[PDB]
Structures are given as C-alpha cells and as structure tokens.
Task: inverse folding
C-alpha cells in the first residue's frame, strides 16, 4: 500500500478511559537528563526506553 | 502494539462472564507457526522449538506489571489485597520499600 | 489454577451383580 | 455473593452438580468397581468439583 492518497479523519469516536494505575516520579529539564541519581533510571514510563535492570547500590 | 512503554485506551462492550477461572500468560516471539490450518506460507518462519505447541517458554521473566481490571472503574485485585494493590508487579527494578 | 477432574467409583479379583 | 438472576447462566452439567459416582445408573457403578484393575472406566466420566 501507500499512505498518501484519499480519505482523512473526522471529529468522531469517544474514547473511554479505563481504571488506569497512577504514575509518578516526575522530573525533567532541557539541560538536565532525567537525573534522579543517574540519567538512565529504570522504572516504568516516560522519556525513552531502558534496557538495564539496575538494582540497589551500596 | 509497537515501540515504547505505558498505556493507551480502549473499552469493550456487551455481556457474558460466569464459570471463569484464571488468566495465564507468557511472552512468546513470533516464530514457527504461521497459523494453524495452513501450510507453505510466507508467514512461516524458523524450525526450532515452538513454545506455543510445547510447554517451553523462556521470556517468562520480561514482565514489569500486569494490571487486570474490569468495567473501566473497577479494579479486580482491589480491596488492598496486595502492597501495591492496583496492579500485580512481577519484577521491580529499583526497590526502596523492601518489597 | 488448572482443571480437569475425573473420579472412579474377600479374595479373588472380581464378583458383581451390575446390570440394567 | 451468589444471588437470584443467575438461573439463565446456570444449567450446568459436569461443571457443577452431583459427583461422577452418583450420576451413573446404579448397575454401572457396580460393574465399574469390580473390573477397574484390568479395564478402567474412571476417566470416562468427569467429576464436578465446586
């Protein structure tokens, strides 16, 4: 297929939102790097994907 | 669903539950079976172990959480059963509460 | 969990009066 | 818990109800007992557990 051609979206479709678990641990700056002790901090959601399963330091 | 963590919506309609038992789940990888009832497909891949038709699984450790709810405002593990009660976790990267 | 339950119901290995 | 309005969902046979060794005709109960050592008939019936 392709993506450029004829038909375009409307103003329609109610999306209903679920129970939804809370999310927090906010912090950002444009000269920071999400530094919460380290810039890559694994824990769910926000910013850009992790790949490290870092666990407790001494 | 492709590329990056978190949540996006739905809600789903109509009726029927009763004589319901657990939920069981594992992560697979798109591998050998193209779909059952077919053969010689371009969807056919690999030739190793099939974790879908064998009891093999090996990505059953790649889960962070698995919230299960109902309705859209009822949370099934509700009643404060767990110490994080609105979701079942499976692994916690960075633990500070000793859970 | 998991399911699928099935259930089964002097010397000399047999003697019975089982009929319709 | 279990309350009225649950009858249309109900009509359950071998999911709920009386045990396997009581569903059967009484003569087949006797036959099965005597011969279950060379010739099983225990797995040919499903026993509800609630």
Result:
């Amino acid at each position: 297929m392709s993506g450029s051609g004829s038909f375009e979206g409307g103003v329609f479709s109610p999306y209903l939102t679920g129970r939804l678990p809370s999310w927090a641990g906010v912090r950002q700056n444009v000269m920071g790097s999400t530094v919460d002790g380290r810039p890559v901090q694994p824990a769910n959601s926000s910013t850009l994907t992790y790949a490290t399963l870092s666990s407790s330091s001494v | 669903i492709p590329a990056n963590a978190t949540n996006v919506p739905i809600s789903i309609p109509s009726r029927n539950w009763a004589a319901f038992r657990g939920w069981s789940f594992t992560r697979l990888k798109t591998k050998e079976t193209p779909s059952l009832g077919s053969g010689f497909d371009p969807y056919f891949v690999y030739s190793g172990s099939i974790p879908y038709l064998d009891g093999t699984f090996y990505l059953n450790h790649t889960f962070k959480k698995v919230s299960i709810t109902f309705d859209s405002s009822v949370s099934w593990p509700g009643n404060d059963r767990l110490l994080t009660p609105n979701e079942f976790e499976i692994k916690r990267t960075v633990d500070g509460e000793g859970y | 969990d998991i399911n699928f339950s099935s259930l089964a119901p002097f010397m000399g290995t047999w003697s019975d009066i089982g009929t319709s | 818990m279990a309350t009225p309005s649950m009858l249309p969902q109900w009509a359950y046979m071998h999911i709920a109800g009386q045990d396997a060794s009581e569903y059967l005709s009484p003569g087949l109960v006797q036959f099965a007992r005597a011969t279950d050592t060379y010739f099983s008939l225990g797995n040919k019936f499903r026993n509800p557990t609630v």
